[PDB]
């Protein structure tokens, strides 16, 4: 069985490379961040532009929704994170503490905490309510490419150009595990699976891998795409077939069967690297976003 994603909408408006796209957990919205220093909000089903959210002084590399779809957090080259109230557009808090670009960010499932990763080689954990940094983890020896909480928020996974994925105890800040395979290419992305059992990691040797976190071993590898340079997001698609989704440096979106590792579809249309993809939480919808020569977001829909 294979999905049938087809281009439904192309979303224009960002004036520089788009850096990330994320669907709100309630399925109503798509948020995008960009090198143009802006966040844009779009209708998830119709692609219709909603609003722009501004305030960062330099480009944004990442943006993430709170569990209730009310808040966003953005990570910027201006070395801050900002917490936004989506409905009012207000910047609630500016998170200052990183000494270099903030590259990646996420709320915990409770959305009382934010985790961030930076070019300063650290992972920081912030209180959402106060904007105060609670812990600084000396996580890596190179820029941190991705940070993500597991299902109950007790663990943080981080990845880095240093070639490592590390798993941290949220409460204690202790490094519980370091994961690396037979080679040491930069790790460009990481995230826990929906059930919290696995870790999906991208490396800059054209490879995605599914890790059993508890056993500390690679279970599945997904190849066929091009990823040697950019920190491209990857997703678990769970609304229809169980797929792995990722952008690629050949300007395509790749979709693999999670279990069999076979490529099942490739989506063509972008004119630059697909840096970011997101999977709608209830509909078979994929959002894809591309870099500077393209500047657009595309919405694809399947009868899976």
């Amino acid at each position: 069985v294979k999905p049938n994603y087809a281009l439904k909408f192309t979303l224009a408006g960002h004036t520089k490379a788009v850096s990330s796209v994320k669907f709100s957990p309630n399925g109503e919205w798509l948020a995008s961040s960009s090198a143009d220093k802006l966040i844009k909000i779009w209708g998830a089903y119709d692609g219709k532009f909603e609003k722009t959210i501004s305030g960062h002084k330099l480009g944004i590399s990442d943006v993430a929704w709170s569990s209730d779809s009310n808040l966003l957090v953005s990570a910027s080259d201006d070395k801050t994170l900002k917490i936004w109230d989506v409905s009012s557009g207000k910047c609630l808090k500016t998170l200052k503490g990183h000494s270099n670009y903030v590259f990646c960010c996420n709320f915990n499932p409770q959305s009382n905490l934010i985790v961030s990763g930076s070019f300063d080689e650290s992972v920081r954990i912030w209180d959402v309510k106060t904007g105060k940094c609670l812990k600084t983890l000396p996580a890596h020896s190179d820029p941190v490419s991705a940070v993500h909480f597991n299902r109950d928020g007790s663990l943080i996974v981080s990845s880095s150009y240093d070639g490592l994925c590390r798993i941290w105890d949220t409460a204690s800040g202790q490094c519980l595990k370091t994961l690396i395979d037979d080679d040491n290419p930069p790790v460009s992305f990481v995230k826990f699976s929906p059930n919290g059992k696995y870790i999906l990691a991208a490396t800059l040797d054209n490879t995605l891998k599914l890790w059993d976190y508890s056993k500390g071993k690679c279970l599945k590898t997904y190849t066929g795409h091009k990823n040697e340079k950019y920190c491209i997001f990857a997703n678990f698609s769970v609304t229809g077939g169980k797929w792995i989704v990722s952008g690629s440096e050949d300007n395509l979106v790749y979709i693999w069967n999670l279990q069999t590792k076979e490529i099942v579809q490739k989506l063509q249309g972008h004119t630059d690297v697909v840096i970011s993809t997101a999977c709608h939480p209830t509909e078979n919808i994929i959002a894809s976003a591309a870099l500077e020569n393209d500047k657009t977001i595309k919405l694809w829909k399947s009868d899976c």
């Binding site: 520089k16 850096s19 960009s34 090198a35 143009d36 944004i60 590399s61 080259d77 950019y230 920190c231």
Partner: peptide
Amino acid sequence: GCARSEG
């Protein structure tokens, strides 16, 4: 414009 798009 941003670290991620620079790669």
